[PDB]
Design a protein around this ligand. Sequence first.
Ligand SMILES: O=c1c(O[C@@H]2O[C@H](CO)[C@@H](O)[C@H](O)[C@H]2O)c(-c2ccc(O)cc2)oc2cc(O)cc(O)c12
Ligand SMILES: O=c1ccn([C@@H]2O[C@H](COP(=O)(O)OP(=O)(O)O)[C@@H](O)[C@H]2O)c(=O)[nH]1
Length: 454
Amino acid sequence: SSLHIAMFPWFAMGHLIPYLHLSNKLAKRGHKISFFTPKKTQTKLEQFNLYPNLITFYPLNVPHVDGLPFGAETTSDVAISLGPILMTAMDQTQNQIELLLTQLKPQIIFFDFVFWLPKITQRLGIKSFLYFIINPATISYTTSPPRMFEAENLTEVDLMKPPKGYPTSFNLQSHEAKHLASTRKIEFGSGIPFSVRSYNCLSLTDAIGFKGCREIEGPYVDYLQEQFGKPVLLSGPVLPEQSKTALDEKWGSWLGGFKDGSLVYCALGSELKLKQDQFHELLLGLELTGFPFLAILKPPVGFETIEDALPEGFKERVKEKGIVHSGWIQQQLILEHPSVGCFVTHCGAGSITEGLVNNCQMVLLPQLNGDYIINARIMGRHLKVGVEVKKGEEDGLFTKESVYEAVKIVMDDENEIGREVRSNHTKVRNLLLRHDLESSCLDTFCEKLQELVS
Ligand SMILES: O=c1c(O[C@@H]2O[C@H](CO)[C@@H](O)[C@H](O)[C@H]2O)c(-c2ccc(O)cc2)oc2cc(O)cc(O)c12
Ligand SMILES: O=c1ccn([C@@H]2O[C@H](COP(=O)(O)OP(=O)(O)O)[C@@H](O)[C@H]2O)c(=O)[nH]1
């Protein structure tokens, strides 16, 4: 029997997009989806609704919280420092969520962040499902009970090693453990410290789910199931679905003028702005490679145009070989273009999947975020599908020479590290695209959802 599922993702394109990818897969199986989305953002999402008779959008008015810029709905609309206020605004949709649930009456609601929700749903006879599109290795590392019980005694040296029982080994740099130790305590919406919030969601929800498959995410989901004592499901790897919009002709035309596999694509997601010095170092490192490149970057901190922040003489030197662009582009379609030979990525969970299912060599440039860092360690050291750009142990900065070297290594047909990461990437792509991998993940996922509402 088909399920009625409501979708309440965090107000971020990196959550809205994979929730919609998964929605399409569930609707193909006959399930009815009530998709809650910020009102103005809906128009950008219709693009991806492949089953409009089963997937219905319901608009949310993102309320006012003092400090929130006017009209802002998504982390793509605000600077990263304003994220906690946007969290307070999502907390404030409670009364209009509670009324949407009362009239739509879904059996299950997938959600992010709103740890108050399982108390509404238990009252309405609805099952709460905390559905993560970030890595379970990240939640396992920072938010498992052993971490939470040390409370404010948790230090940088504590975060340098995994929590007790953690199934895997990898190394953090000093500045990364420093980042995790401090940001953990910073308020993220309505006065709740960040890790407390996520922990409250894990503890109070009926069940948990993650993007991923047993072959890669398995050990972390088993660890989390053992720790929290409730089902931790895997949706499958949420392979990107095809959009209804073709590749913009101006990009298709420009990309079509380069030799196959010759272009370096660089993008750091839609939520981040580099500091100027690292913006310069990145762009000069791309220039040093001599390869054509497309860099999708916001202007650096303190700057409003790409023009004003480019290193001196940059435009005149790179000529038609390189473009630096700050607008939203169709990243998934660009990564499928045969010109692209290399993807320099901030290691966001969605960008990681998009690179894995394509042919591009991966260069890992994780930005200062626990999931990006952990994704980078897993891709660089466990799966060994990419080369990570070296950062200063204490300052977290890279040089233009380190960017150049990483790209050169993976682009060199005769370099043995490049051949190795190509070979390992092919292994992972062949697994994720295996004819029965995602479908069998979804088979199990949907059975376990049926048990949940039984
Ligand atoms: O990056 C993280 C993250 O997601 C991310 O949290 C950012 C705020 O810190 C936000 O800006 C991004 O849009 C979002 O993808 C979340 C998260 C996401 C959805 C949830 O339902 C609950 C938690 O937990 C984290 C926990 C960590 O120990 C470290 C992290 O790095 C993240
Ligand atoms: O100009 C852009 C920037 C991002 N994306 C998409 O936005 C999502 C970004 O998610 P990810 O987790 O990689 O990073 P974030 O942007 O949340 O940091 C992915 O599906 C990208 O393909 C896109 O299509 N165009």
